[PDB]
């Protein structure tokens, strides 16, 4: 990271106003999840927050929550479907490689588990300049 | 129709308000749950837990 970039990732079965979706999402500040429909139009991006562009639209949704202002330098994570439990694990640690993952050992501790009850088959990253 | 909620009515006439509610099936995890007992703790001696 070094540089933040990486703000946020959307899953769900179809995310083209169709079918229940989930979206995940960071400013630095706070974690703002939810389970919504939405279209995607033209891929969320930062575009420069002096600008600012929102992504999709509001519609039908059934799950919201806060929290949590969430922070070389790499980040882990791991994302699995449960039975109806959405599960996110985690971890940092600081790097002087620049190529890519380095060796050692890492262990993932948990965050919060989600109860969504929807099935998820796709996914795409939400970026920042 | 509009109501006609007369005060000089019988109770019949009168107005109620009413609060319908249901649940769903068991589809995914439980989400509403009622509030669960918390006892106060014990120590150096045999009891049962959960
Ligand atoms: C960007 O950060 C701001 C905080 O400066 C977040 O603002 C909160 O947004 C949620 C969701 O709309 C509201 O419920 C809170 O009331 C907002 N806080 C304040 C102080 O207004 C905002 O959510 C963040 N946005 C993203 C996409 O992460
Ligand atoms: C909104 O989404 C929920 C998801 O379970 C669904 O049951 C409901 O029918 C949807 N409503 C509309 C108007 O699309
Ligand atoms: C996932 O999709 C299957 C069909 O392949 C469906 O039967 C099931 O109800 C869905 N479950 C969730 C949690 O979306």
């Known amino acids: 990271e070094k540089s933040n970039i990486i703000r946020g990732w959307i899953f ?3 995310l083209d106003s169709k079918t229940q979706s989930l979206l995940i999402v960071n400013n630095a500040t706070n974690v703002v999840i939810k389970v919504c429909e939405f279209q ?3 891929d969320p991006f930062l575009g420069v927050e002096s600008e600012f562009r929102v992504y999709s639209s509001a519609n039908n949704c059934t799950f919201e929550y806060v929290s949590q202002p969430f922070l070389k330098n790499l980040r882990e994570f791991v994302f699995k479907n449960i039975d109806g439990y959405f599960k996110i ?4 640690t600081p790097i002087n490689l620049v190529r890519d993952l380095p060796q050692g050992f890492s262990a993932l501790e948990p965050l919060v588990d989600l109860p969504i009850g929807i099935n998820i088959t796709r996914f795409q990253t939400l970026l920042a300049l | 129709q509009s109501y006609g909620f007369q005060p000089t009515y019988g109770v019949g006439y009168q107005p109620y308000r009413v609060v319908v509610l249901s649940f769903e099936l068991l589809h995914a995890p439980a989400t509403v749950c009622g509030p669960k007992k ?5 120590k150096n001696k045999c009891v049962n837990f959960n």
């Open chain 1, 40 to 42: 995607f139009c033209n």
């Open chain 1, 12 to 14: 769900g079965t179809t």
């Open chain 2, 38 to 42: 918390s006892t106060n703790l014990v």
């Open chain 1, 89 to 92: 694990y985690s971890k940092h």
